[PDB]
Design a protein around this nucleic acid. Sequence first.
RNA 1: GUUAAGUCUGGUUUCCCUCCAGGGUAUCUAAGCUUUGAAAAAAA
Lengths: 153, 154, 173, 95, 95
Amino acid sequence: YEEDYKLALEAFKKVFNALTHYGAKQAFRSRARDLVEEIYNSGFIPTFFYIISKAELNSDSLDSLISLFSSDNAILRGSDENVSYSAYLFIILYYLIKRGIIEQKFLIQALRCEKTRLDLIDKLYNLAPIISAKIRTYLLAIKRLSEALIEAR
Amino acid sequence: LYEEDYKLALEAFKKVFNALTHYGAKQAFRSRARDLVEEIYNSGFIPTFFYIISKAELNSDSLDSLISLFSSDNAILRGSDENVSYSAYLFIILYYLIKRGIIEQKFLIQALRCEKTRLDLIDKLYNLAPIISAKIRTYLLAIKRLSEALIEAR
Amino acid sequence: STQREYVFIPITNSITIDVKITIGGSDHITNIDERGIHNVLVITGYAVDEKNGRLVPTLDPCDYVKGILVAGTPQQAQSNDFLTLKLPANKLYLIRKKGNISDDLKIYIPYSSPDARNSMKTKPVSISDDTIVNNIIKEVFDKIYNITQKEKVKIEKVKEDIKELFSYYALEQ
Amino acid sequence: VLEDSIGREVINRSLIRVRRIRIDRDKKVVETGGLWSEEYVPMKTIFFSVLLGKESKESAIFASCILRNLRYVILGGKETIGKGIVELRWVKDVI
Amino acid sequence: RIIEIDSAKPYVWVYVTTYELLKKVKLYLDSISQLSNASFSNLKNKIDTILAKEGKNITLDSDLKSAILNEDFYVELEALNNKIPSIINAGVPLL
RNA sequence: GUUAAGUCUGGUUUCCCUCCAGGGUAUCUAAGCUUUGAAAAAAA
């Protein structure tokens, strides 16, 4: 029994539907193949900083990302690289809401207000040693799904 | 009571982010955070640091708010956006120097306050150079990631 | 059935008596067990009107008010200005979740009209000036929590939580 | 020859960080995201290595015919930017 | 890798061990001293006088009293008893 | 007409990586030992 593969299935379902343009999907595939090895070597917090820096957390994309947590009709817009980093960010946050590491209400109230994403990063920094051990198999499954389903250039 | 580079950068960026009232100051600080790290590498820490101090134009009242920033979360950096940004980045660097116990807060506030202590600061920085250039660029890389993450591109 | 009443935690001395309940039930959602506060409701989108303290509604997700939860209804001098409602014990924004809830409850809110006469430009203010910390432990954290100085001698613990765990956005108006 | 606590910082800031860009060949400006840095090791930098060989009739030919005519090679990447040429000295005949 | 704090002695790197590995070495020595006539009272005594200080981080023969290891982890250090010869050869402290 | 006096301004913005490669190949058990020694016909 490996339920992180089912969690990866449902998260990959959501993000594979939320990426309209195929270039966005291929970009997410490259993100998935890179960031798991990056979080292995470098740790969770540096990789998370890198991810949120390349994700362009404007309230627009933040709102599409919040709506992904409920809708399955939400869409991620932006450049292919931007949306791929946002999709990987949603992957991580989805794993965190599931597995109860972070309350969903706190996550949503942080993604809404800009004065609270800092508290979100603080909580994630406090929990990073746990997250680093937990999410490895989930992210490896995400990577396998990406390179299985999304074609490459 | 030891904060790793990323935790330290988070807590510094928090005060810097709440202290920049007008959004254009934040957007300029973003470009400061994105270029000054490679500047610090290429030209050295000490030259870049006094370059930042000069670009801030501490103005004797920008300096007083910059100092109140260390004490209370109620402070505010006022001035031109392209100067307030440099003053906020100067605060970033001073916060690092202080919390890492490399240089004392009283001495740094003095060396920023008036003229004689500034050259003593130059001396002290040349004495403390290997302690500073050891790991400050990781702290500034964290600052740069945070500013790229939390401030919209212009 | 059970029913709680929310009371906001401002920096003000206006919460002495507006309520007619002390215990009512057998337990409260908000807890203090040698660790500090737990299960603190975080009302979002609402401001405070500490000039006759109430919870003004706003539209900012950034605006929020925090406070504790105990059973009861307010003073039976109300039911015309309160945002009373039933919740399925899951839609509650809580922090330090220690004791789960039993799928249902009812809460009352100190509430007022949005005052359609001025732009509501808010101001986020914490609760410092430990003198206010002490008169807030005495005003409300004693009257309803007789657990104090009965089981808990660690005031200076419940102190440090009230500093960091309780804030709110103010109106400034 | 410096102490190790001071020489680490000196040596690490002794490398060349060059910025490169990519030009959007329609607007003839920098492509979005097309900006990066590359560290180089200065010319005339010296590294030390050893080439060990186990016994064989070929190792003899290798060490007497191949290594005696092996002087310049190209190391690393960025070769078309003219960034790889290296001389091999062979301590055997330098010291 | 180490960055010194509270000290005035430059160390660029340091030897690091843990109490679990020492407990394992002690089990090795204890079992091997019974299955053979040999004995290692010297190594055993060094290891046991270290393991007596379990629960605290310990610098072996130096006086660092504090340090940050591998760029991430800050540790306070006690000096065990500054008359224990080092088991390692080189004059690097052992944490 | 004469004199006399210059004054203001002294670097800003953007871009901070993108794409491919995310393991391939060989080996995937081998050789032994495969039962031995006591009890096979017992007293009523």
